[PDB]
Amino acid sequence: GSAEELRTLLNKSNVYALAAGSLNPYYKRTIMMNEYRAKAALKKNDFVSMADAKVALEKIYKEIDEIINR
16 A cells, blocks of 8 residues: 555665765755655655655656666
8 A cells, every 4th residue: 555655665765865975966855855745645644645755756766776776
């Protein structure tokens, strides 16, 4: 379900923010924005915001992985 999936993504957010210190400031600030949006969406049980934060976090983690790995 969306809440559990989103918490799992959040559990990697600080790790990804540290890794993002090697890259343009865009990456960390995108992670931090979505930490805020994800945490607020969970607290309100807002499924629309939970889905948006899930997609955004998946997207930024993939971007960071692809820069660092390639």
